[PDB]
Amino acid sequence: PCPPVCVAQCVPTCPQYCCPAKRK
């Protein structure tokens, strides 16, 4: 369960499997 804003923005509220390689 990934947020669609985490697809650009991998934050402390967001999952680690939900990190891209486009702005963490």
From TrEMBL:
Superkingdom to which the source organism belongs: Eukaryota
Protein's organism: Hydra sp
Protein name: Mini-collagen
Coiled-coil stretches: none
Gene behind the chain: N-COL 1
Residue pairs linked by disulfide bridges in the UniProt entry: C2-C18, C6-C14, C10-C19
